[PDB]
Amino acid sequence: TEACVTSWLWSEGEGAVFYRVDLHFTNLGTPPLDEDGRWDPALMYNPCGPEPPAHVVRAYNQPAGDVRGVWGKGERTYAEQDFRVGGTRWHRLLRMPV
Amino acid sequence: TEACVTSWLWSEGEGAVFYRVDLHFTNLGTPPLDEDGRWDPALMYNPCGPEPPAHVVRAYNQPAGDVRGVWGKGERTYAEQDFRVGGTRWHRLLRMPV
């Protein structure tokens, strides 16, 4: 059972990039578990692919904490995080709920 | 349909839920503010839906340190987080390539 939400992300400087990210959320209900009751999905299931470039993925999946701006209006509002990853500055807009 | 990575997110306790998240990446070219300075209409345009429930989204984006790194079908590296938010304990896996 499916849901989705969209992010945006872009870097600065020479060779700057700009991506849309559609996060497709799938509810797996109650999957099979081991003893104790632990799930090990990274090893159980096949990942999607082919992968985007390495540095783009590291940047999107970076922790960054400091919400530094709020974009958009009304019901479609986005939190901006602003961070560097090895000399490259990134901006990442995340949908923020109510 | 272009470039893709996978994440995993799950909770413990009664009402535990389990989710696969596929992150679809679409290269949009140059960062959205040009030197003129006009905006790319692609930015925040046509967000996907419907959106996942608020506690799920919040959990997915909660700041949390990496507990450990794991593999990963095909020796693919993931960062793991183990954290609590809203009284609920969550586990999270994020694709993190080098």
Numbering used by the authors:
A (entry chain A), B (entry chain B): 24 to 121
Excerpt from the publication:
Rubella virus is an enveloped, positive-stranded RNA virus with virions ranging from 500 Å to 900 Å in diameter. The structural components of rubella virus are comprised of three proteins, glycoproteins E1 (58kDa), E2 (42–47kDa), and the capsid protein (31kDa). In this report, we have used a combination of cryo-electron tomography, sub-tomogram averaging and in vitro assembly studies to elucidate the three-dimensional structure and assembly of rubella virions. Instead, the structure of rubella virus, as shown here, has an irregular helical organization of its surface glycoproteins and a pseudo-tetrameric inner nucleocapsid arrangement.
The third structural protein of rubella virus is the capsid protein, which interacts via its amino-terminal domain with the viral RNA genome to form the inner nucleocapsid. The atomic structure of the carboxy-terminal domain of the capsid protein is known and presumably forms the structural framework of the viral nucleocapsid. The cryo-electron density from about 20 isolated tetrameric units seen in the tomograms of the in vitro assembled nucleocapsid cores were re-oriented to a common orientation and averaged. This showed that each monomer of the tetrameric unit has a dumbbell-shaped structure. The structure of the C-terminal domain of the capsid protein dimer was fitted into one lobe of the dumbbell shaped averaged density of the in vitro assembled nucleocapsid tetramers using the EMfit program. The two top fitting orientations for the capsid protein in the averaged density are 180° apart, relative to each other, along an axis perpendicular to the two-fold axis of the capsid dimer. These best fitting conformations of the capsid protein are similar to the orientations of the capsid protein expected to be facing the viral membrane. As the N- and C-terminal domains of rubella capsid protein are similar in size, the remaining density of the averaged dumbbell shaped unit must be the location of the N-terminal domain of the capsid protein. Using these fitting results, it can be deduced that the disordered residues at the C-terminal end of the capsid protein, not seen in its crystal structure, likely correspond to the thin strips of density visible in the cross-section of rubella virion tomograms, linking the inner nucleocapsid shell to the membrane anchored E2 signal peptide in the viral membrane. The dumbbell shape of the capsid protein also accounts for the double-layer appearance seen in the in vitro nucleocapsids.
